[PDB]
Symmetry: D3
Subunit: 156 residues, 6 copies
């Protein structure tokens, strides 16, 4: 049983770690799949985001980190994945998540989207919020893996 | 991984929306328990025995589905059944805040039980057992939303 | 086009918010039926006869409004009345998901009936018959939210 | 400014979420009245006398908190108590539209009373007295969500 | 009775077709009004969007397609329209729709905003989502009129 | 008792005036704090936004208008503020407001976020909406203080 957890992960946060950890407790193999996402003009290059996520998930034996620029549904088919994991924080996210999941189902009917709920601890954070605080030199050590925090400090 | 999943609800009665969710759950988990609550607080249209028999008949074609009634706190039942996955259907019209409250409470009660949210087909994304019953009680056509055995049982229930 | 529109609800009692919606509906459709549900499930404060008389008096100045009671599934009543438009008021505080469920169910029941959502004035965007009744029962001033005849009827109802 | 604030609710029973909100309110307002509604419509698990005593004991460490029962429209009670601030707790799972309806209605009733929304700790952002009671009635562990005196009272209530 | 259905329509989708068709069953004349929308940096020029919508709605006799750069309320007044149609997909859209409708009411009190609900089939699609899938070469034939699909393929 | 009311205020609207007025009826001193917000690419410079807000709030004796480029939580600590005011218009705003308030609480636990509800009159307006209408020469006199309206007319 192979699951894909796709996203921009710009950068990967403790919220993302929480979701991928939950996914590994449920599925045999989890592919953490980092989308290139040029339209979002990411802070970190795809190569940097992949390296950060690889380092942050090395303790989890059944996580494979990969980058992709393809249509997500095509990438999931090409990874032999039948489960698509997404984290569900709030209502505003849920509605866009429904659109994406219905589109993905149209593109690959056998790829089942599943939503996981993060810990209360990470229910109010996002990569965007963490970057905004860090741009103003605010302490974000609590929200990121150590290697990501260092990389964000170094980047800024 | 030999995962056991539970899909709890009142299933009063079981709809095509519930069939769609339980079908999707069987494609990703080895064993799925469709767990029917006594749900005395709501005062159900169908008795637990009727709800169980309707659900067994409607899911008989799915080999890895077990239909079972329960009267305890769902988390207590999931624990006793050795389930590690809790299936929740998320319709386009679901109370998202309530689902969050429920999942956090279930996680407090049984941390080893993971809540997983599945999405039904667009076809069943706007219905509920509640709306189906209300429409049928008021002489509306609900055949499209139900398994054939459920349609027959509901017609018989409303006739008396 | 000689469009017939229906504006259903419990109108228990009719408020300035309902008057605002029905007024807007008369400006765009030739004939508007303000359709009052028996709504026995909720157990209304005012009887159907009281609700109808209050609504007739409050809408008498609108020439193309017909106030009518109904006990069937609203879609069944809209079909029998040859209505092709179903008016729903959408307040800033409406249950959007419920409105979607209702409109899709109404479309399944009668495809030729189009649900149209109208927006009330900002003035009435945060009230409901439910909140108005609760406030009045608890000795609060609701005069501002009601037609004068409704204010008089509600005071008389609460006095006994 | 010698501000008097009111924090109304049914507190059936008072939870750690309510304690968190009332604590935050005492840090910004000089006097906080924790106002317990008779709330007969809901039919509460605990009587008003039980709810008041539980809340007094759970807030005794907060010097500027006064626990008081009330049976009038909350706005009528706030007016008589010379309160100019109305505390509302806003959980991650609150009915935002309902809070808006309530605040606008309270502003219509008493314009000099300002509704202020406080946010509880992430720890209590997904609970309610309703969910806590439901879980406890169904043999679930709710100790974590309640003050110790409330936990003892709830166990005694459910035992009989 | 004249109704205006305004939007960016970048490009027009089957969801938009569904709404305009419903609008023609209710009102005598429907103006499908395409806003220039430079702030949104559209994929298609106004002239292209107008031509695509004209071709896509030619089967509906009481639809007139027009482009505009004016304040929408002024354009509706200038078209003698008294009805403003908008499609209502989800909660997140509904709130911004309320702001726009209350502003339009302030600008032109007699222009009544009316919301129509799309078919379940088109309830999870948007021009943005279709463009995102098409940018990654994903199949969008199901969501667009034939002429629009060809034009989107040709544009990309 | 010192409260801070932070925001981009690009430009300050009658909705913002309504909130700051409510805040002064509750707290002894209110700092209306204008964030530089370069990421939002504001129409008005920080100096212009500060001057507009100063003029618009001069009638309120206990309002101090200040600009800032710092982390908001650091600025609140540096202003000796213990209350953070935000206006709550709708559901979509509420969710992002929760994230910001939980982050601010992590950065400064003693700074209490409080939400105030605007008048029905201003419940559907925003700086963005007012600028959009004004860009198309629509009448926005009703939504802005006189000095702001003149400045917006002059800017456009
Ligand atoms: O399969 C898909 C269906 C619908 C839209 C989609 N957009 C893509 C492009 C890749 C991408 C971009 C941003 C973020 C991610 Cl996780 C992936 N694939 C999609
Ligand atoms: O595990 C739980 C956690 C929180 C609340 C819940 N209430 C129950 C009681 C049983 C019940 C009632 C209605 C429907 C079902 Cl599926 C089950 N279990 C829950
Ligand atoms: O056409 C309908 C479709 C779906 C559900 C609905 N329930 C009814 C029953 C009648 C009713 C009850 C309360 C209020 C009114 Cl306005 C009407 N009609 C509906
Ligand atoms: O001032 C008010 C305005 C609007 C509605 C309200 N309903 C009441 C009645 C009393 C009550 C009932 C339940 C819970 C409480 Cl805290 C108070 N007061 C309200
Ligand atoms: O009448 C109006 C009221 C409020 C805002 C408005 N913005 C405009 C500009 C034209 C425009 C831009 C984008 C999309 C459309 Cl459909 C129209 N008119 C407006
Ligand atoms: O304390 C904070 C916590 C979380 C995010 C934050 N972003 C900032 C930067 C300043 C800023 C930018 C835009 C708008 C405002 Cl009101 C303030 N401070 C923050």
């Amino acid at each position: 049983k192979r699951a894909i957890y796709p996203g921009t992960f710009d950068p990967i946060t403790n919220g993302h770690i929480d979701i991928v950890t939950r996914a590994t407790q449920m599925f045999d193999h989890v592919i953490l799949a980092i989308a290139a996402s040029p339209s979002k003009k990411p802070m970190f290059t795809l190569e940097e985001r992949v390296a950060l996520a690889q380092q942050a998930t090395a303790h989890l034996g059944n996580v494979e980190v990969v980058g992709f620029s393809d249509l997500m549904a095509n990438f999931a088919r090409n990874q032999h994945a039948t489960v698509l994991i997404r984290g569900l924080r709030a209502v505003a996210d849920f509605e866009y998540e429904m659109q994406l999941a219905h589109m993905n189902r149209h593109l690959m009917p056998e790829l089942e989207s599943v939503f996981l709920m993060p810990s209360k601890e990470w229910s109010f954070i996002s990569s965007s919020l963490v970057k905004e605080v860090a741009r103003h030199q605010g302490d974000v050590t609590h929200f990121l893996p150590e290697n990501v925090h260092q990389a964000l400090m170094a980047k800024l």
